[PDB]
Amino acid sequence: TMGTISAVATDPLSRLTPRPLYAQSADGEAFELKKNTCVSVSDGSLLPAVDVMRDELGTSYGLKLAEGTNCPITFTLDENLDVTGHVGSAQSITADEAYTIVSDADSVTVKARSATAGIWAAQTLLQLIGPWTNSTVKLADVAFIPAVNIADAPRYQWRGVLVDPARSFYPLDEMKQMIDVMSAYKMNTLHLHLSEDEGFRVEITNDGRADGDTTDYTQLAIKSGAISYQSAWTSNWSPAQDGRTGYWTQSEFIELVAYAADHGIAIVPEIDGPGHSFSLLHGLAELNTGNSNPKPAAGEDTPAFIQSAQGRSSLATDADITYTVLGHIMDQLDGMIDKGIKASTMPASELKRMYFHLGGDELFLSGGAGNKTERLQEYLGRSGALVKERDKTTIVWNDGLDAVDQIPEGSVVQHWTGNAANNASIQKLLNQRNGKIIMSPAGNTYFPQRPGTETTGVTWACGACTTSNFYQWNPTSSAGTTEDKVLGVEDALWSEHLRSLNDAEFLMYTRMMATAEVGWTQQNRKDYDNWNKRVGDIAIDLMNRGANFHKATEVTSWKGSYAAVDAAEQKVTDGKVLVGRYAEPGLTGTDGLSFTATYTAEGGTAVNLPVTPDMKQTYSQQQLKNGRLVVNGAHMNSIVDVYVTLPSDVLAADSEAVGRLDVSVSSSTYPIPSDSSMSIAIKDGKVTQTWTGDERPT
Numbered sequence: 001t002m003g004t005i006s007a008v009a010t011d012p013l014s015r016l017t018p019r020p021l022y023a024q025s026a027d028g029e030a031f032e033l034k035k036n037t038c039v040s041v042s043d044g045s046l047l048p049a050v051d052v053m054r055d056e057l058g059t060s061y062g063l064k065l066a067e068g069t070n071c072p073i074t075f076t077l078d079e080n081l082d083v084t085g086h087v088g089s090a091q092s093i094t095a096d097e098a099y100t101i102v103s104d105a106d107s108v109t110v111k112a113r114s115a116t117a118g119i120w121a122a123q124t125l126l127q128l129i130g131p132w133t134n135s136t137v138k139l140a141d142v143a144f145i146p147a148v149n150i151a152d153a154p155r156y157q158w159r160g161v162l163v164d165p166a167r168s169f170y171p172l173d174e175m176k177q178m179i180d181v182m183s184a185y186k187m188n189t190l191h192l193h194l195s196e197d198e199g200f201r202v203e204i205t206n207d208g209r210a211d212g213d214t215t216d217y218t219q220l221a222i223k224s225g226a227i228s229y230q231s232a233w234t235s236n237w238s239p240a241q242d243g244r245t246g247y248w249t250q251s252e253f254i255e256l257v258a259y260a261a262d263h264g265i266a267i268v269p270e271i272d273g274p275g276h277s278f279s280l281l282h283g284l285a286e287l288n289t290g291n292s293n294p295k296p297a298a299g300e301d302t303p304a305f306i307q308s309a310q311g312r313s314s315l316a317t318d319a320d321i322t323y324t325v326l327g328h329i330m331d332q333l334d335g336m337i338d339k340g341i342k343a344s345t346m347p348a349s350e351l352k353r354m355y356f357h358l359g360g361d362e363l364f365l366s367g368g369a370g371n372k373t374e375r376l377q378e379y380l381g382r383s384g385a386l387v388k389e390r391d392k393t394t395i396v397w398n399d400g401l402d403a404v405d406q407i408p409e410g411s412v413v414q415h416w417t418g419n420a421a422n423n424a425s426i427q428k429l430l431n432q433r434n435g436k437i438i439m440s441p442a443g444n445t446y447f448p449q450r451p452g453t454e455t456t457g458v459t460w461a462c463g464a465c466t467t468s469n470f471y472q473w474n475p476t477s478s479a480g481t482t483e484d485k486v487l488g489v490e491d492a493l494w495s496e497h498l499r500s501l502n503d504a505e506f507l508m509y510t511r512m513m514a515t516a517e518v519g520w521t522q523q524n525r526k527d528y529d530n531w532n533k534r535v536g537d538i539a540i541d542l543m544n545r546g547a548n549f550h551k552a553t554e555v556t557s558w559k560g561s562y563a564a565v566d567a568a569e570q571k572v573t574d575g576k577v578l579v580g581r582y583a584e585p586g587l588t589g590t591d592g593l594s595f596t597a598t599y600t601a602e603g604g605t606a607v608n609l610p611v612t613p614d615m616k617q618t619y620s621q622q623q624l625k626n627g628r629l630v631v632n633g634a635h636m637n638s639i640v641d642v643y644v645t646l647p648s649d650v651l652a653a654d655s656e657a658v659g660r661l662d663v664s665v666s667s668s669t670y671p672i673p674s675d676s677s678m679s680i681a682i683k684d685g686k687v688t689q690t691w692t693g694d695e696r697p698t
């Protein structure tokens with residue numbers, strides 16, 4: 001077979017991640033999105049779903065996507081929506097998140113069991129439209145929703161990411177960037193590890209304390225916001241830079257909850273104790289009492305943030321003030337979560353997650369009275385009772401199950417270490433105490449585990465925990481239980497070594513998109529090789545978002561993708577105008593790219609135009625200096641901006657000139673070239689209009 005090949009968009013249904021329960025092509029032509037296509041909703045709680053579509057498509061395709069009456073696109077809330085006809089004998093769904101999409105050339109009909117499911121339908125629709133919907137510039141092509149029949153719902157109700165800002169703070173705007181991609185893959189839970197040995201990351205005020213509580217809670221963020229993970233206390237490849245300091249103000253935290261809610265994501269706070277608790281002792285003089293450790297130096301009210309304290313924290317398990325303080329922190333987080341949900345337009349019934357994570361990490365024992373276990377059992381007994389009296393379900397890590405009998409009936413273990421199927425404590429929780437499990441086995445879900453053998457990172461769980469390790473497991477089987485006992489899964493972003501959103505995203509992506517599939521897709525509809533093939537498009541969307549990602553060697557679908565840009569919205573400078581974008585992961589430069597641009601005016605013959613490729617940043621793998629990771633060393637190349645220089649002639653025509661612009665790109669690093677054809681109208685030295693169809697839009 002001698003000749004040439006030209007790149008083509010993938011089949012829309014073949015792209016979908018997570019893979020839906022049921023997804024089939026329907027008869028006839030695609031639905032064409034127009035600037036003024038409106039959307040009808042049966043209920044105001046579906047406007048967040050439409051907002052997610054507008055946030056992308058307003059920029060990428062110039063769509064208003066305004067709310068209207070009797071629109072061709074409809075979102076209907078149906079609390080009885082039944083997708084069980086697509087659930088086989090070997091399958092299991094949590095129906096609250098169910099949606100259906102039925103589309104044809106004239107109409108796009110979405111039914112959603114919940115407001116959350118509306119957002120999931122929106123995310124599916126944006127994957128069907130394609131991987132350029134997050135373009136920061138308006139594209140020349142029009143957007144199409146293909147004719148489909150989709151019925152979908154998740155296997156697991158709990159599909160989460162733990163973020164640790166306690167080791168190293170993340171500003172609100174970075175958290176929003178994480179939320180966008182989590183929502184994109186139908187993750188519904190953001191677990192905030194708010195407190196550690198090395199930091200406390202949310203403002204607690206003195207409003208609404210219990211009668212007689214004179215604790216000055218303002219000092220917690222003031223003192224322990226100002227500490228972070230210390231590079232000097234490491235002897236390894238950790239960056240030379242300490243963790244970022246800071247904390248979310250109450251107003252920032254409320255915004256974080258609201259933004260998460262508006263993207264279908266509930267907040268689950270963790271205030272870890274009785275161990276991993278130094279920030280609480282450092283922050284609040286009042287907690288330095290009873291059997292707390294380490295103690296303040298003679299004359300000081302708080303213990304010093306020094307290397308000797310590392311690994312040696314315990315709250316006072318024997319002191320009333322410990323539970324007073326936890327109760328107040330719980331009430332403050334609850335108040336701010338309620339305010340954030342109110343600010344969102346999402347229902348509290350869906351977005352107020354009635355769970356509190358106590359952690360249950362083991363305390364360091366120094367003083368006498370009580371062994372580690374007795375003190376832990378007292379702590380999780382009392383702190384468990386705090387969560388239950390607040391109408392919530394207690395979560396603890398594995399270490400917490402030394403207190404399995406003392407935490408409330410119905411409590412949850414977040415499993416990360418060893419074999420859950422063979423763990424007597426876990427099986428007692430699930431079988432004897434009506435408990436449930438959240439699966440975060442380190443080897444399948446811990447992002448600091450290095451994603452490749454060429455990378456620098458944590459090695460203990462897999463050597464390298466690749467997309468294969470993140471994809472190829474069954475959480476129900478790993479837990480040795482039944483579907484009904486498994487809430488779901490969480491990835492964990494621990495920040496001992498993380499100093500930037502860029503360096504977090506390197507570890508998070510694309511492994512999070514494998515966890516998303518494990519959370520959502522039926523066991524018997526999983527196919528690692530198929531998921532692997534779908535990463536090429538996932539990556540084009542991440543580059544459009546400006547999100548970093550590990551270019552994993554085991555992924556074989558990395559590709560170059562070309563999009564014609566609407567030059568009507570682009571400035572002509574010295575005859576040069578942006579007409580294309582070329583997204584190819586891994587480019588260390590543009591010298592391996594060959595562009596050809598041909599302009600044919602009505603009345604004229606083909607004229608070669610000079611092409612100026614512009615790539616802001618090049619691709620780099622991790623960088624080390626003095627045996628330590630450089631912050632932001634690993635970063636993705638930009639999308640290439642493809643400029644042409646229009647002839648002086650055409651730009652000096654005071655009469656409108658219409659022409660065809662053909663651009664081709666060949667890459668030395670991707671063997672399938674792209675060919676693009678766009679019509680452009682030019683008047684008074686400006687591009688006035690572009691179109692990629694056979695006929696000029698009016």
Ligand SMILES: [Cl-]
Nearest residue numbers: 088089090091
């Ligand atoms: Cl089946």
Ligand code: NA
Nearest residue numbers: 126127130133
């Ligand atoms: Na998309």
Ligand code: NA
Nearest residue numbers: 566689690691
């Ligand atoms: Na146009």
Ligand code: NI
Nearest residue numbers: 446448449458
């Ligand atoms: Ni780890």
